[PDB]
Each structure stands twice: as C-alpha cells, then as structure tokens.
Structure 1
Amino acid sequence: PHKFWNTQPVVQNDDSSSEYSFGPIEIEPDSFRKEIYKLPDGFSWFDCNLWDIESQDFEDTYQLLKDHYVEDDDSQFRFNYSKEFLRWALCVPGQKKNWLVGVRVNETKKMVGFISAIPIKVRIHNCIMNTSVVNFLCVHKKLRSKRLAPVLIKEITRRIRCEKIFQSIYTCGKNITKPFTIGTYWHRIINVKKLLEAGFIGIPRNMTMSSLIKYHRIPADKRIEGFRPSVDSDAEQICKLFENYFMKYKDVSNETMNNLINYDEINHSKELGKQAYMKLDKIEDLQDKITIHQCFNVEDVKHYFTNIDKVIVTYVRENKNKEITDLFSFFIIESTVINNERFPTINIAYSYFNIANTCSLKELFNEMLITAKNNNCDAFNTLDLMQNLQVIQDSKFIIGTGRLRYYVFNWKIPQISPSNVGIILF
C-alpha cells in the first residue's frame, strides 16, 4: 500500500474513470508549497556542482551512483555512469543549477542522496509543453527504507514548480503507480564469451558453445554506404529531419498538428488550462503512431545528437545534394559486474533516436550495430519503443531481463503501446 504516491497527482494502479483520456490531472499554479522540505537532523541540501568536472561534488556524485545506483534484480550488475556521461546527460540546454540536488551528512561531509531534473520539450497528443524529466534518484544503501526518497521527490517537485512547470516524465525498473506504457529491452550480443562469463547471458542446455557464438555473430558482409559522424554544423538539417519524422508518425490530424495546444500559455489558470482536456474515440485511433515524444530545437540537437567518446554516437547519411536523409544514434554506459574479478565491467550501447528514410530500419540498425561494436561495446540494447519492433522481429535480438515502466506526473495518458512512445531516458 502506498503512503506517498497515494497523495500525488498521478494515475493510481486501481483508478480508471474520467471521460477525458488526455490532459492535466490537476491545474494548481498558485497553491503549491514553496517552502523547502526539512531533512532529518544532521543532513543538508546542496546544489550539486556538476558544472566543473573536476569539482568535489562531481567526484562525490560519481562515487555515490557507482556504489548505490540501479542494479538488476539479481544484483549482478550496477550502472557505473562516467563523469563525462553525467555532464552530457544533465548539463543540458536550459538546465537550472538548482535542479541538481544533493544530500550531504553534516558530520562527515559525505553525499548520501541525489535527485535531478532536466528540462525537455514534449508533444503529448494534441498538446505541447515544456516539462521535466526526473532521473538519477539515489539514496545510500545504509539509508534505505527510511522514507527519505519521498522527501527528495517532493523537493525536486517544488523546484520544478517554481519554474512554472507542473508535469514530469520518469521511468523506473519497478511498478510504482500505474504506468502509461511498459518498455521491454532487447540485446544484440556482440561479445558472447565475455558476457557469458559475466553472467549477462546464459547458454541454453541443448546448444554448443560454437552454436551460441554463431547465433549472435554480426555479419559485416552486408553494408550500406554514406554514413558519417554528425558535426555541429549539421544541427539545422538534423532538426528538420526530426520535425519531418514526428510529422510522419503523429497520432493527431494534420489540422490538429498545426494547432497544437501550448500548455505553457494556459497552465497559469484553472479556467484556461481546461482547454488541454481531450477525449479519444477509441484506442485503435493511435495504432502504430507516436502519441508522446521529445521535441528538439537546433540547440537541443547540437547538444544531444553529437559524438563524445564513450558517451554518445550519432551518424548521418547524406544525399548528393547534401541533404541529411537518415540518422542513427546511441549512448553508452559502463556497468560494474559486481564481485567479478575476471571482467569487472561491461560496456553497453543503448539505442537513442533513429530515422531511416533511404534504407530499411533493419539496415540502419545493422550499420549502428557495427558501429557500436567498433566503439568497444559488449552488447547493443534497444527498447520496443517507436518502430523498433521492425528490427527486433525475426532477428538475433534476445530479450533482456527487466521492464521499464513509463510514468507521467500530473498528466493523463491512456495505457498505450511502447510503439506509441518516443521518450528515451538516460
């Protein structure tokens, strides 16, 4: 039974009612608490200085997450985010310094808690809005099960609402409240023997070692030409590429797409904010379209769809008129292999956003797989979001352990298919 989430504007696991399928759960621009939340005696809030990669805050945050962030259910693996990755994932265009939130023990000066928000722009059906993503929530193992996490959630909620933002998106490896979709990870295994020794994959009973190796082998015999690393001067062309992609796969009419409700212009008023409520005739109306996605301006594109060693890879294809026609991208995270002396870490690539116009999506993903292999990744991960089932189906991808639950704070989204979701979190 919930003692915190029962009190919050989210869809509850037992709730189903309103005649509107989409729109804000509440419109409360004036009534939210603005006084900072108290921590237990001996603890203090701090704004975490990730603006200097050499700072002590950055070292403490890196160590905190290294030893206390997300593990798989069997506690065999734990993410080991690099400082360069954290800098890229959190020091994003428009970021606020007070949205990087730490908890420090006064007596020891040790950082024992972290929570972060980043600003993003999204479309949800017939509305657009500036919103937030909450990520990297983390409490030190010795402080778990003491109801500290709700204090962190309430505090970042306060700091986001002070910027006039009243919704947030987050994902979780667990069922908390009712998720609006569930994402399933799939693996393309690159280094079979290493990942078998690390316990990331098993070998089945009626299969020889050489059969498992051959099963997962990458043929680099079929290649397609013209892909190159993106550079900053590609940002206008990439921006238009994403615009055209989201127009192609939108779940609303051409008329609505050109008259999207801008929630930021009405969220100050209970009366006007009601304009964001929308009924859905039938769920099948959404089939195979995107219902919710991130939106990128040129500054965003320059930040995210770049190339940073061991962090993010983005390649683009050009036509002879130097139009950019295709894009693949993936980010990279190292994970600790807990208590493994032989292979103490593994390197996993994660599909980010991909746009195939002049080749098939399998062909695009094949060039990306080869590129991930060339970036010393041990496996390539893809969710079944967007159109990624076209590459998972009838392929060598194998299912991952765990499920990603997608959540929206203070908005109503009907339960939808992951193919209707274009939100990738770090």
Structure 2
Amino acid sequence: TPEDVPNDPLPLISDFEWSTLDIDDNLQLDELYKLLYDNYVEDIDATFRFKYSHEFFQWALKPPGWRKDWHVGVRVKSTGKLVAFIAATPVTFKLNKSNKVIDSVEINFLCIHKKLRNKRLAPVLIKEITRRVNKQNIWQALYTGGSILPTPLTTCRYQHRPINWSKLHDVGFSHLPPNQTKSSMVASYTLPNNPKLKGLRPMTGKDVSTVLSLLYKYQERFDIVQLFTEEEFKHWMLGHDENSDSNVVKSYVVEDENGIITDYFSYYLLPFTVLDNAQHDELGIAYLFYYASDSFEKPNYKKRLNELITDALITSKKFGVDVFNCLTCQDNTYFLKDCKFGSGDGFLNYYLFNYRTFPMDGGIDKKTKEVVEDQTSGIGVVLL
C-alpha cells in the first residue's frame, strides 16, 4: 500500500455490530452492569463477582476529559444484546528517567461474553479502541492483565491484608495455616479502632493544590508516574464532586503542629459478592490507590510509611472492608511484611502500547516471583 487494488481478501458478513455505549443513559449503564457482572473475571476458584455500582462507573469512567466514543461495545444484530466492551480513559503519564510527558490513555474494562471466548474477538476490540484513540493523536497506551501480549513493563503481585479474618475464612478465601486456631488468627490480625497518627483527617477540595505538590515530589523516585491537573486529581481523590461525599474513593491527609500536610493516602472500594454462602453475600474490599509522605528523605521513612498505611487500615473498617488489597508497585514493599500483608496468588502485567522503554521493577523477585522487602519499584501509577 498504497495500492491500486488491496492485496488481502475483504471482510465477510458478521452477526455482531459495533455500538458506542452511553453511560449517560441509565438504561445502557444497566446493560454494562449486567455484562460485567455476568462475564468478568474474579477469583480463579470461581464464587466471587465484582459488585459494580452506578456510583462507581461515574467515577471510574468519567474523569475530566473523558469521551463517549471511547466507550466501545459490541452487540448482536439480531437481539441487540451487548456482548463485549472495552473502554479508554484519558491519562497523562511521564517517564522520570528520560524526562518526558506523554498524553495517552488507560485501556480498561476489556470484557467479552462468557460464551464468546476463543474467537479472537479480544484482539479485534483492541485495534478498534486504538483506532479511535489514534484519531485524537494519542499513540501510547497503558493496560494490565494476562501475560498474553509480549514485552511488558514489569510484573507486580497481589497482597491481601485481612481486616476481618474470620468472615474471610467462612467464605473459603483465607486458609488456616498448619496447626493454629481460628480464634488466634483473629487476633494476629486485629487492629485498633482509631487512627494512631494525630493530625489525620479526611481530605477536602482545599487540600488538593497542596497534596498534589507533595505527591509530585514523592513520585520522583519511580520510573513512570502520572501527572494530574487540578480538576483531575480532585476527581480521582474526591469523587464526582466534593460537595457530595464519594462512597467509592476515600482520601486522607495528615497535618503537623503547624498545620502542614506531610502525609496522605487514598484507596478505593469495590466489594465482591459471595455466592453460595448462607451467611453473607458481600465481601468488603479496598484497593490502595495513591499516597505520599515528605519523610522519604528523612531516615524514619519506612517507620512512618508503616504507621501511615496502618492508619489507612484502621479507617477501612468504618466502611465494612474485610480485606485490604494492593500490589507490589510503588514503595509498598516497605510496609507489606510488617503490616501483615499476605502474599497473594494473582499476577498483573503492565503494558505500554507503542513505546519502547527499559523494563522496570515490579516489586517481586523476578525469579521466585515472591515479594522482596524495601525495594522501590519503577511502577508509580495505579490503574483500576
């Protein structure tokens, strides 16, 4: 190409047709819900379902600067049924080593009907969202998932911090180690009911300006981070709006005796559903989002980094969280071990579409794929 006559054969008719979704129309947002609730991953064992919420979608999929045309779905011509979806959300990331800002997107929510796998549909979905994205002059992309596509940035591993061990054991998630005691393990995980750190309080739209700077100076230690604007950060830490508490994302700051912000952390909530259980049908879960501390240069860093995350946990209880989850990215390996974070079983792979760059650290010993204490990781961004 360019050619007089295309060399390869042309497409044959299909039973599916492209349909851009409108999460503004509650009727469609409802379909998206059903699609994900019925065919999206979960625990390998198979007994869990993400508990999406109308309030979670507005948060996750409508960051400032979002586009509808990036919400692509595939429906069946006959019945109209929505059988696939893939979304793209605007994000600005930067490499700290080579110093470069790259306005790109975050490919998320790739989903195909449980009974439509093995049709090479997945790939078709990507090249498409990409085609649309490439139309806005963006040429790179971030995504996480199966070790399918080659040349991944790095690999991180799951970590689970049991807040309500018992309930977890009921659902068959956490297993009781060789000779111990349900009653005893419950203590090994027990935590206070109040944040140890003083000057700790929820964040507000007034702390954005500040916190963003604190963050911007903390991430310097990673090879790839995210660069938010003021309207963006607010959204991602505060929710649709400040004048109305977000039930999805929780953020907190710590002030000193002078009224200055020295630390901060955030985390989001997205529970599970316990199926064939006669006790409960909802597992509270929180994912560690972004955080920061100006003590990184100080010598007490890690000591502080542990208190900080430990308070974040004590707060997770006011929301029904039964397990606190995070990966091995960022400087998490500093607080894992001592906070009683349990090593998981799942692995995540980060990808950067159309852009070569040195592989970074995932936080795990590349050989045993097991966690490695105090080891700053290249990955300093968090994707849902």
TM-score (norm 2): 0.85
Residue identity (%): 39
Distance 1:95 1:168 in 2: 15
SS at 1:353's partner residue? strand
Of 305, 312, 317 in structure 1, the residue corresponding to residue 237 of structure 2 is 305
* Partner of residue 271, structure 2: 334
Q: Which residue of 2 aligns with 1:397?
A: 341
SS at match of 1:141: coil
Please name the residue that 1:223 is paired with.
196
Say which SS state the counterpart of residue 296 (structure 1) adopts: coil
Give the structure 1 partner of residue 178 of structure 2.
Answer: 205
Question: Would the alpha carbon gap of residues 233 and 66 (structure 1) be closer, same or farther in structure 2, given more than 3 Å must change?
Answer: same
Residue 73 (structure 1) aligned with residue 49 (structure 2): no
CA deviation after TM superposition for structure 1 residue 174, in Å: 4.2
2:277 aligned partner, one-letter code? N
Instruction: Work out the CA distance in 2 between the residues paired with 1:107 and 1:339.
Output: 34
Distance 1:378 1:47, change over 3 A: same
Give the aligned partner of residue 422 of structure 1. 380
TM-superposed deviation, 1:78: 2.9
Q: Distance in 2 between matches of 1:228 and 1:208?
A: 36
The separation in 2 between residues aligned to 1:103 and 1:332, in whole angstroms, is 28
- Code of the aligned partner of 2:330: M
Q: Distance in 2 between matches of 1:316 and 1:355?
A: 10
In 2: Cα distance, 1:425 partner to 1:51 partner = 23
Change (3 A) 1:103 1:40: farther
**Contact 1:237 1:323 (C-alpha < 8 Å) held by counterparts:** no
2: CA distance between counterparts of 1:395 and 1:366?
7
Task: For structure 1, list consecutive stretches of 5 or more residues without a partner in the other structure.
Answer: 1-36, 250-289
Aligned amino acid, residue 414 of structure 1: F
Opposite residue 197 of structure 2, the aligned amino acid is: I
The answer for the alignment partner of 1:239 in structure 2 is 212
Paired residue for 2:113, among 113, 131, 140? 140
Q: How does 1:3-14 map to 2 (within 5 A)?
A: none
The within-5 A match list for 1:186-201 is 186-201=159-174
How do 1:240-319 residues align onto structure 2 when only pairs under 5 Å count?
A: 240-247=213-220, 249=221, 290-306=222-238, 308-319=245-256
Partners in 1 of 2:149 and 2:44 — Cα distance? 15
Alignment of 1:105-116 (within 5 A): 105-116=76-87
- Equivalent residue in structure 2 for 1:406, among 328, 350, 362: 350
User: Which residue is 1:165 aligned to?
Assistant: 138
Q: Secondary structure at the match of 2:179?
A: coil
Post-superposition offset of 1:339: 3.3
- Pair 45,213 (structure 1): closer, same or farther in 2 beyond 3 Å: same
1:227 Cα deviation from its structure 2 partner: 1.5
C-alpha displacement of 1:246: 2.6
Question: Secondary structure at 1:206's aligned position in 2?
Answer: coil
Quote the Cα distance in structure 2 between the aligned partners of 1:56 and 1:305: 27
Paired residues, number = 347
Give the alignment partner of residue 373 of structure 1, picking from 317, 329, 335.
317
The change in CA–CA distance for 1:72 and 1:222 in structure 2 (over 3 A counts) is: closer
Residue 347 (structure 1) aligned with residue 284 (structure 2): yes
C-alpha contact 1:238 1:301 (8 A) present in aligned 2: no
Equivalent in 104, 108, 123 of residue 150 of structure 1: 123
> Is 2:85 aligned against 1:85?
no
Secondary structure class of the residue paired with 1:185: strand
Aligned residue for 2:52, secondary structure, equals: coil
- Unaligned 5+ residue runs, structure 2? 1-9, 240-244, 296-300, 363-376
Which residue does 2:14 correspond to in 1? 41
Residue pair 1:77, 1:338 contacting (<8 A) in 2 also: yes
Query: Take 1:138 and 1:221, find their aligned partners in 2: how far apart are those partners?
Result: 40
State the partner residue of 1:271.
none
Q: Which residue identity is paired with 1:424?
A: V
- Post-superposition offset of 1:220: 4.5
Q: Check whether the contact 1:191–1:379 (CA below 8 A) recurs between aligned residues.
A: yes
Q: 2:194–2:315: 8 Å Cα contact kept in structure 1?
A: no
**Aligned-residue RMSD, C-alpha:** 2.0
Which of 324, 331, 334 does residue 387 from structure 1 map onto?
331
What is the rounded CA distance, in whole Å, between the counterparts of 2:52 and 2:152 in structure 1? 26
Instruction: Give the conservation status (yes or no) of the 8 Å contact 2:66–2:89.
Output: yes
Cα offset, 1:234, TM superposition: 2.1
Taking a change above 3 Å as real, the CA distance of residues 372 and 411 of structure 1, as seen in their structure-2 partners, is: same
The alpha-carbon deviation at position 74 of structure 1 amounts to 1.9
Q: Which residue of 2 aligns with 1:96?
A: 67
